[PDB]
């Protein structure tokens, strides 16, 4: 939905989510008019512009929280 719990393994990201969720707040410090509308299509214009490097180091982060979520969420649900 948006935030089940801090200790619970929320939805797994995938590089892009790690970059956008971390770059969006940066765009706000310099772009006050950057509303969710332009903020959604702005961070994307940069990601596609980057070569095969922006998704090299920030892509392994989404592969570490998936080995604990796929195994921990099985018992966290129990419904």
Describe the structure.
It is classed as dna binding protein. Keywords: HMG-BOX, DNA binding protein. It forms a monomeric assembly. The protein has 79 residues and is mainly α. The protein has a single domain (1-79), classed as High mobility group box domain (DNA Binding (I), subunit A, Orthogonal Bundle), CATH 1.10.30.10. Helix content is 52%, strand content 0%. It contains 3 helices and no strands. Helix 1 packs across helix 2 (36-49). The longest helix is centred in the N-terminal third of the chain and has 15 residues, at 16-30. It is flat, with a radius of gyration of 15 Å.
Please report the distance between the alpha carbons of the first and last residues: 17 Å
Overall 3D form: flat
Please tell me how large the radius of gyration is. Answer: 15 Å
> What is the chain-wise order of helices and strands?
HHH
Number of domains: 1
CATH architecture, please?
Answer: Orthogonal Bundle
Work out the strand percent: under 5%
CATH superfamily: High mobility group box domain
The tally of helices reads 3
- What is the third-level CATH name, the topology? DNA Binding (I), subunit A
CATH C-level label: Mainly Alpha
SS-derived structural category: mainly alpha
Biggest sheet, in brief? none
Number of DSSP-assigned strands: 0
Portion of residues within helices: 40-55%
Region (Disordered): 2-64
Family: Belongs to the HMGB family.
Organism: Sus scrofa
DNA-binding region: 9-77
């Amino acid at each position: 939905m948006k935030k089940k719990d801090p200790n619970a393994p929320k939805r797994p990201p995938s590089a892009f989510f790690l970059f956008c969720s971390e770059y969006r707040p940066k765009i706000k410090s310099e772009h006050p008019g950057l509303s969710i509308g332009d903020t959604a299509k702005k961070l994307g214009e940069m990601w596609s512009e980057q070569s095969a490097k922006d998704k090299q180091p920030y892509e392994q982060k989404a592969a570490k929280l998936k080995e604990k979520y796929e195994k921990d969420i099985a018992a966290y649900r129990a419904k």
